[PDB]
Design an enzyme around this catalytic site. Structure first.
Site, mmCIF file in Angstrom:
data_model
loop_
_atom_site.group_PDB
_atom_site.id
_atom_site.type_symbol
_atom_site.label_atom_id
_atom_site.label_comp_id
_atom_site.label_asym_id
_atom_site.label_seq_id
_atom_site.Cartn_x
_atom_site.Cartn_y
_atom_site.Cartn_z
ATOM 1 N N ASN A 1 -7.356 0.426 2.237
ATOM 2 C CA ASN A 1 -6.196 -0.239 0.679
ATOM 3 C C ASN A 1 -6.647 0.965 0.140
ATOM 4 O O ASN A 1 -7.842 1.399 -0.077
ATOM 5 C CB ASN A 1 -7.118 -1.390 0.637
ATOM 6 C CG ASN A 1 -7.199 -2.997 1.334
ATOM 7 O OD1 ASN A 1 -8.725 -1.999 2.391
ATOM 8 N ND2 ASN A 1 -6.580 -3.626 0.979
ATOM 9 N N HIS B 1 0.942 -1.122 -0.079
ATOM 10 C CA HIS B 1 0.240 0.180 -0.271
ATOM 11 C C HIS B 1 0.979 1.221 0.076
ATOM 12 O O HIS B 1 0.535 2.720 0.078
ATOM 13 C CB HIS B 1 -0.940 -0.183 1.589
ATOM 14 C CG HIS B 1 -2.321 -0.787 1.048
ATOM 15 N ND1 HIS B 1 -2.902 -1.657 2.434
ATOM 16 C CD2 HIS B 1 -2.320 -1.884 -0.024
ATOM 17 C CE1 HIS B 1 -3.869 -2.259 1.685
ATOM 18 N NE2 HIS B 1 -3.554 -2.931 0.351
HETATM 19 C C1 LIG Z 1 -0.803 -7.874 -5.167
HETATM 20 C C2 LIG Z 1 -1.701 -7.364 -3.887
HETATM 21 C C3 LIG Z 1 -2.318 -5.977 -4.436
HETATM 22 C C4 LIG Z 1 -3.542 -5.883 -3.223
HETATM 23 C C5 LIG Z 1 -3.630 -6.919 -2.237
HETATM 24 C C6 LIG Z 1 -3.443 -7.897 -2.713
HETATM 25 C C7 LIG Z 1 -2.604 -8.599 -3.236
HETATM 26 C C8 LIG Z 1 -1.749 -9.814 -2.759
HETATM 27 N N1 LIG Z 1 -5.275 -6.739 -2.460
HETATM 28 C C9 LIG Z 1 -5.786 -5.271 -2.813
HETATM 29 C C10 LIG Z 1 -4.551 -4.422 -3.086
HETATM 30 N N2 LIG Z 1 -5.329 -2.824 -3.367
HETATM 31 C C11 LIG Z 1 -6.826 -2.655 -2.642
HETATM 32 O O1 LIG Z 1 -7.093 -1.465 -2.758
HETATM 33 N N3 LIG Z 1 -7.806 -3.758 -2.306
HETATM 34 C C12 LIG Z 1 -7.347 -5.739 -2.260
HETATM 35 O O2 LIG Z 1 -8.013 -5.643 -1.829
HETATM 36 N N4 LIG Z 1 -3.631 -4.581 -3.619
HETATM 37 C C13 LIG Z 1 -3.133 -3.050 -4.471
HETATM 38 C C14 LIG Z 1 -3.649 -2.722 -5.792
HETATM 39 O O3 LIG Z 1 -3.469 -4.425 -6.397
HETATM 40 C C15 LIG Z 1 -2.959 -2.037 -6.186
HETATM 41 O O4 LIG Z 1 -3.222 -0.495 -5.424
HETATM 42 C C16 LIG Z 1 -2.426 -1.446 -7.870
HETATM 43 O O5 LIG Z 1 -3.170 -2.615 -8.050
HETATM 44 C C17 LIG Z 1 -1.881 -0.454 -7.928
HETATM 45 O O6 LIG Z 1 -2.861 0.088 -9.567
HETATM 46 P P1 LIG Z 1 -1.970 1.023 -10.403
HETATM 47 O O7 LIG Z 1 -0.969 2.182 -10.138
HETATM 48 O O8 LIG Z 1 -2.400 0.452 -11.554
HETATM 49 O O9 LIG Z 1 -0.564 -0.031 -10.667
HETATM 50 P P2 LIG Z 1 -0.266 -1.493 -10.901
HETATM 51 O O10 LIG Z 1 1.491 -1.963 -10.174
HETATM 52 O O11 LIG Z 1 -1.221 -2.486 -11.025
HETATM 53 O O12 LIG Z 1 0.261 -1.418 -12.343
HETATM 54 C C18 LIG Z 1 1.083 -1.418 -12.989
HETATM 55 C C19 LIG Z 1 1.783 -1.858 -14.263
HETATM 56 O O13 LIG Z 1 3.256 -0.521 -14.903
HETATM 57 C C20 LIG Z 1 3.751 -0.674 -15.764
HETATM 58 N N5 LIG Z 1 5.059 -1.005 -15.912
HETATM 59 C C21 LIG Z 1 6.682 -0.656 -14.186
HETATM 60 N N6 LIG Z 1 7.169 -0.447 -14.946
HETATM 61 C C22 LIG Z 1 6.598 -0.002 -16.566
HETATM 62 C C23 LIG Z 1 7.147 1.044 -17.171
HETATM 63 N N7 LIG Z 1 8.585 1.472 -16.804
HETATM 64 N N8 LIG Z 1 7.040 0.718 -18.963
HETATM 65 C C24 LIG Z 1 5.364 0.084 -18.580
HETATM 66 N N9 LIG Z 1 4.790 -0.310 -18.071
HETATM 67 C C25 LIG Z 1 5.525 -0.274 -16.620
HETATM 68 C C26 LIG Z 1 3.733 -3.068 -15.169
HETATM 69 O O14 LIG Z 1 3.613 -4.317 -15.389
HETATM 70 C C27 LIG Z 1 2.167 -3.667 -14.861
HETATM 71 O O15 LIG Z 1 1.185 -3.629 -14.970
HETATM 72 O O1 LIG Z 2 -0.988 -9.039 2.382
HETATM 73 C C1 LIG Z 2 -1.249 -7.618 1.291
HETATM 74 C C2 LIG Z 2 -2.469 -7.824 1.210
HETATM 75 O O2 LIG Z 2 -3.589 -8.297 2.249
HETATM 76 C C3 LIG Z 2 -5.130 -8.235 1.831
HETATM 77 O O3 LIG Z 2 -4.811 -9.317 0.935
HETATM 78 C C4 LIG Z 2 -5.786 -6.640 1.342
HETATM 79 F F1 LIG Z 2 -6.791 -6.781 0.857
HETATM 80 C C5 LIG Z 2 -4.343 -6.057 0.579
HETATM 81 O O4 LIG Z 2 -4.761 -4.390 -0.331
HETATM 82 C C6 LIG Z 2 -3.464 -6.125 0.639
HETATM 83 O O5 LIG Z 2 -2.191 -6.077 1.247
#
Ligand SMILES: *Cc1cc2c(cc1C)Nc1c([nH]c(=O)[nH]c1=O)N2C[C@H](O)[C@H](O)[C@H](O)COP(=O)(O)OP(=O)(O)OC[C@H]1O[C@@H](n2cnc3c(N)ncnc32)[C@H](O)[C@@H]1O
Ligand SMILES: OC[C@H]1O[C@H](O)[C@H](F)[C@@H](O)[C@H]1O
Ligand SMILES: *Cc1cc2c(cc1C)Nc1c([nH]c(=O)[nH]c1=O)N2C[C@H](O)[C@H](O)[C@H](O)COP(=O)(O)OP(=O)(O)OC[C@H]1O[C@@H](n2cnc3c(N)ncnc32)[C@H](O)[C@@H]1O
Ligand SMILES: *Cc1cc2c(cc1C)Nc1c([nH]c(=O)[nH]c1=O)N2C[C@H](O)[C@H](O)[C@H](O)COP(=O)(O)OP(=O)(O)OC[C@H]1O[C@@H](n2cnc3c(N)ncnc32)[C@H](O)[C@@H]1O
Ligand SMILES: OC[C@H]1O[C@@H](O)[C@H](F)[C@@H](O)[C@H]1O
Ligand SMILES: OC[C@H]1O[C@@H](O)[C@H](F)[C@@H](O)[C@H]1O
Ligand SMILES: OC[C@H]1O[C@@H](O)[C@H](F)[C@@H](O)[C@H]1O
Ligand SMILES: OC[C@H]1O[C@H](O)[C@H](F)[C@@H](O)[C@H]1O
Lengths: 576, 576, 90, 90
Positions: free
Chosen positions: B551, B506
């Site tokens: 979250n 987070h």
């Molecule tokens: C892994 C995880 C994540 C979350 C929870 C559970 C687990 C095990 N559960 C959770 C989450 N958030 C919530 O609000 N509630 C839940 O119950 N998790 C976090 C959530 O998953 C993240 O906050 C969210 O995806 C973030 O969204 P985003 O800001 O769009 O970022 P991402 O990391 O999803 O995607 C980014 C993306 O960009 C790429 N990338 C990175 N670098 C580059 C470069 N240089 N060029 C081009 N593209 C790039 C990635 O590969 C990725 O797909």
């Molecule tokens: O272990 C990490 C996860 O725990 C739970 O699933 C939460 F929902 C996620 O957002 C993330 O923090």
């Protein structure tokens, strides 16, 4: 979906895709059903290891494998947990809990047996090792003519290797590979021969390998399409195939009962030809659920009337594993041609060699890589370049050492991967034993208990047979200890050990092949046709009736090619 | 690929897809680049949990999560392994090995921080918990008018909830859910309120939930296509975005440098508008590599001239975890309305209730399920039906308990999942603390060391701040111990513990939002526009400048919707 | 040589471990980062818990131990008393 | 003097221990020395080792000896999980 095809195939693994490749290509109207779903990207059924990200972070791939290996039969758990709070609910017995199979004797299990339900099957995560079997491991396809048998297998294996893109040259410029291979070949010399593991893979760059899969065999795109406008194929994922319907005489299959897992609807599909390629466990399950063999705990007082050998004579390989840390001898040998003066990190330090000294142990391209790495990275104490590929070394099964060997780095790490020892030092050792087929070694299906798909629960009654199989298994462990020590000492946390029975995932003999149903105690003939049935074929390792140590898939594929020749000879495609 | 678009988006996670949804829909010519690849099936960017197989075997899904969480910064390993064979090579120092970052102080790390590089980002594996922030956790979008601020957030959150399909009714018929919820709500009453976790998900059947993802937000199919013939969108996977190119004045971005990871070619792409949604770590990285902030170890004698707050004030949440085993009290309560006579398994055993007794604690549908389960499964000692869904229970953050809570079953299990205790008894507890933003808490990028993609290596300099943040973190642990005990005692192997810093994933505040660059020590304004730039926007949790426990993703999405309103107000799409 | 140890020989390991005091223990460098944020933590791996700062951990005999009791190590030894052949013997 | 947790699942009459002990070449560089700064629990100069198994014959034999124990042990039975072949702490 139609209710009528020329050929229906149950399973989208690499053996189902061998049948698709052959038969879609020959003009048949083909449908293929898989209980699992498309989840490898837009290349349907492709290897999950082929992303840039996994090949830059290969240590993570173990988790992808573990995420799709669902245990076949788990016994009731009897571990005592007595440090619970006194307020917590506890039962007074070890009751049937958490998906355990109450039928399963925990001491006659293959606890490491697992299945994979995804489009492409286990070929979405496999190691891609595709050795041939030598005569000693291999079923006969011609009797009383060894040279014709050898000819037939050569032709079939050559074709299977072309389908999988098998080669032995992908790792030829690795320092680590060479270091290990060269040492072993000197120390046995040449009472055993060492080579690269034959791998179903094409190198695309110095840091990327395209590993083969079901997708390499057949691309699994529906047809007709623009590349193939006169072919006809449909893939139906998330469809559980439940039963084939026998006629009264047991001479023909008249339809396939299917269950759409999304909508929940059930249908019956008609084909001229039915091919079951659902894997060694699940082909058997589907057959037992269709009235072949016997449902329920085996009962000698009432032996099965239809394919009585089905589920008997099962084979799984013993597997021994360790890892080693490269010897000082071998690490020093890498830089043996270098003149090294001063101390790393100081003004006077240098590393030089003389290209073409006849005195050099290594050729120039090696010494160049080593010199550059030593001079450019003086903070690093090892002479191996950072992106050097892993070894991929085998000495194949022979009479005097009747086990398969894979020496290298395998993505399917067992246990916690320790990070303290530099990975360039680490070499994995896996040795695979052959198991004698024995009537008493069975896979059977409960008449009471069901799996997660409502199909009869698989139950193993298995022990490694006590004579030659067990003697060789222990000899094989000794062999790996003796051989490994040529390279280095054991890595703590990866000491020599037997793995859980069935973790090698080379189960065979469940629907085994032979010439004569009764005399060879078997289920399918050398065309992979079920005895007595005109139109039912089984593909997969479950056909292999022999004791084998090498990885079975290339041999299963070869048998499938031969089966498809029979189909092409005996069934006419429908007009387009 | 073209060299000119209206809008370019870096990242295909759920925040990039918020920008796509809004802007593709408004008629812009959009390109989206992701460094990762399509690997979720034919629904591009969808949740990996949505296969039949994972929902029948949910304990396996932890491995899928672990398989795509790649550690941000790993320190040099200093574990002594001294049980190596004397022949094995060993260095005389703890040198930089195995991808470790030599810049990283191991005692000022977020060791559990990880990133996910796949199309759809982390939304391919997330828990789908989407709580709103209350005022106390939430950045201001209007100053000096609390009611207008509340109005603006309500409108934005309502829209974000509609995009993610957030609901609070998916688990309403679970016995376990109800058991836990009802107990907690009685014991605090009603000094705290409990509800279902708001989840981005739609139930399709009693045993299947369609979890939302990036794909739910925007389907990621190229356009024009048949559903959307007048829209224009291209997704380019396996393309590393390396740099945005600044003008001299730092008032406009003039192109995006990209690197095709398959072919190896590099290109420069021109857009009217550039949106970076690469996640909190990687947005920052891309900006530092483009000349924002400062490269290298922070140096107060030479503070950065351009966005000096970038990478400072970073926040990550403390996370405490345990599991419990349901109390005898609560298990007995399930069957409290039953008349139970005789002993399970014998002829006289029966379980009955009287529908509509006003004396009943539970309504008829509960007692029916319980009765049926008890009578039909007399070998089972628990009154909970076998396919009963897990609890999904929260008491949201409040001043008197300033932490978020999730009580239930989470697929992302930590540690070995013990199989001895019946899973219907097991309830997970996760409590998430808010972290004060502090200038000294930084994410910075090495000028020497690079990551696997040749980009400057991320390095954390982070400690939980010593006053309120640390005091609350410990209070929060106490709270989880006190609250959990209402339900049951701790499960051995899952005792109460702090998780590794940054495992909660987070991370916020890396490119933080505020009104005034200097006065609020921030990088983007309330339209998510980078200060001073006309055409550069940042989306994601890295914008959140507050101390938050809930979250963050729904809040990040809300900020993105508002950013897209600004773009729609100030940039004209090109003609189709 | 007590009746009780010879009826319960698996317990005797603990008697041995109870009188083997390590000769030289290096400074410990294991990272424990799942401490509560309120807990005191130093910013370095300092000399702690009887460790010897002189001892290079990679040039140690970490299993070396001494026994300080009347009778010395013969109070717990295995009692194996082989002769050396010429090759091993001064 | 059992090393590690003594597992109770396998009947003890089945269990046989194997310990093999290697000879070490005396080498001037292999030292036990005493700190001039640090003291032990009895206020005496702290013992410090500077020791590595010498790289030629000693190390070669040590590894051969491990192989020997693996080959010899297999005549009797297979390894007990939890007591796999290993070098003990120096
Ligand atoms: C892994 C995880 C994540 C979350 C929870 C559970 C687990 C095990 N559960 C959770 C989450 N958030 C919530 O609000 N509630 C839940 O119950 N998790 C976090 C959530 O998953 C993240 O906050 C969210 O995806 C973030 O969204 P985003 O800001 O769009 O970022 P991402 O990391 O999803 O995607 C980014 C993306 O960009 C790429 N990338 C990175 N670098 C580059 C470069 N240089 N060029 C081009 N593209 C790039 C990635 O590969 C990725 O797909
Ligand atoms: O272990 C990490 C996860 O725990 C739970 O699933 C939460 F929902 C996620 O957002 C993330 O923090
Ligand atoms: C998991 C594994 C597998 C192998 C090795 C590594 C690892 C970790 N490496 C290895 C293997 N084999 C080799 O020869 N060399 C290697 O280096 N592994 C084994 C190999 O992967 C298997 O032998 C091979 O795939 C078997 O091919 P298959 O006979 O086509 O069977 P699959 O299991 O691959 O696919 C079957 C398939 O059918 C489905 N199914 C099952 N039941 C049904 C029902 N009832 N209806 C419809 N469809 C069904 C599956 O979901 C699956 O996709
Ligand atoms: C602990 C151990 C030891 C042996 C084996 C098993 C185990 C677990 N088994 C083994 C041994 N040797 C064999 O030949 N065969 C066996 O099967 N072990 C070793 C053997 O036990 C030792 O080699 C032997 O006792 C050494 O005899 P020693 O030379 O008399 O030395 P000790 O350590 O026994 O006793 C010395 C003694 O002096 C004291 N002390 C130390 N410092 C001082 C000072 N400064 N002032 C006064 N006294 C001092 C001790 O307290 C001790 O009692
Ligand atoms: O390191 C010990 C080893 O050294 C080697 O070089 C030998 F080949 C092995 O047989 C074994 O003696
Ligand atoms: O099981 C002990 C618990 O029992 C309960 O029913 C209470 F709600 C808790 O406060 C605690 O006393
Ligand atoms: O159990 C396998 C063993 O069996 C024995 O009886 C032999 F003596 C060993 O060499 C080894 O072959
Ligand atoms: O762990 C199981 C695997 O080990 C190695 O990768 C083999 F190549 C596979 O065939 C399989 O046995």
């Amino acid at each position: 979906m139609d209710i009528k095809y020329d050929v229906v195939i149950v399973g989208s693994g690499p053996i189902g895709c061998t049948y698709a490749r052959e038969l879609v290509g020959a003009g048949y109207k083909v449908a293929m059903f898989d209980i699992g779903e498309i989840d490898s990207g837009l290349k349907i059924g492709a290897h999950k290891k082929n992303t840039v990200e996994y090949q830059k972070n290969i240590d993570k791939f173990v988790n992808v494998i573990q995420g799709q290996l669902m245990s076949v039969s788990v016994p009731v758990n009897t571990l005592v947990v007595d440090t619970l709070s006194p307020t917590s609910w506890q039962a007074s017995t070890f009751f049937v809990r958490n998906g355990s199979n109450p039928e399963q004797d925990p001491l006659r299990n293959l606890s490491g047996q697992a299945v994979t339900r995804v489009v492409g099957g286990m070929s979405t995560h496999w190691t891609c090792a595709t050795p041939r079997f030598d005569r000693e491991q291999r079923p006969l396809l011609v009797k009383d003519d060894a040279d014709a048998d050898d000819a037939e297998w050569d032709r079939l294996y050559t074709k299977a290797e072309s389908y999988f893109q098998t080669g032995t040259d992908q790792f030829k410029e690795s320092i680590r590979h060479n270091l290990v291979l060269n040492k072993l070949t000197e120390e046995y010399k040449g009472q055993r021969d060492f080579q690269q593991i034959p791998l179903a893979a094409t190198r695309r760059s110095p840091t990327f390998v395209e590993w083969s899969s079901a997708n390499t065999v057949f691309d699994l795109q529906n047809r007709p399409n623009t590349d193939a406008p006169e072919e006809r194929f449909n893939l139906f994922p998330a469809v559980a195939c439940e039963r084939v319907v026998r006629n009264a005489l047991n001479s023909e299959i008249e339809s396939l009962h299917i269950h759409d897992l999304i909508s929940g609807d059930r249908f019956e599909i008609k084909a001229d030809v039915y091919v079951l390629t659902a894997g060694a466990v699940h082909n058997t399950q589907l057959l037992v659920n269709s009235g072949f063999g016997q449902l329920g705990r085996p009962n000698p007082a009432n032996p099965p009337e239809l394919l009585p050998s089905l589920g008997s004579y099962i084979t799984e390989q013993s597997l021994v594993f360790c890892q080693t840390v490269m010897s000082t001898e071998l690490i020093d040998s890498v830089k043996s041609d270098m003149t090294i003066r001063g101390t790393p990190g100081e003004l006077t330090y240098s590393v030089t060699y003389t290209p073409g000294a006849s005195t050099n142990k290594h050729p120039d391209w090696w010494n160049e890589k080593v010199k550059n790495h030593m001079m450019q990275h003086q903070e690093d104490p090892l002479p191996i370049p950072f992106e050097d590929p892993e070894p991929q070394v085998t000495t194949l099964f022979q009479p005097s050492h009747p086990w398969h060997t894979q020496i290298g780095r395998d993505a399917f790490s067992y246990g916690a991967v320790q990070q303290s020892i530099d990975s360039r030092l680490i070499v994995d050792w896996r040795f695979f034993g052959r198991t004698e087929p024995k009537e008493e070694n069975k896979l059977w299906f409960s008449d009471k208990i069901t799996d997660a798909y409502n199909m009869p629960q698989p139950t193993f009654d298995f022990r490694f047979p006590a004579g030659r199989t067990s003697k060789e298994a222990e000899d094989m462990m000794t062999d790996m200890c003796v051989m490994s020590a040529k390279i280095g000492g054991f890595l703590p946390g990866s000491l020599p050990q037997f793995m859980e029975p069935g973790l090698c995932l080379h189960l065979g003999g469940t629907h085994r092949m032979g010439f004569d149903e009764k005399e060879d105690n078997c289920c399918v003939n050398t065309d992979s046709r079920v005895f007595g049935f005109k139109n039912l074929f089984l593909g997969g390792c479950g056909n292999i009736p022999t004791a084998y140590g090498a990885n079975p898939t290339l041999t299963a594929m070869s048998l499938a090619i031969k089966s498809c020749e029979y189909i092409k000879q005996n069934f006419t495609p429908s007009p387009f």
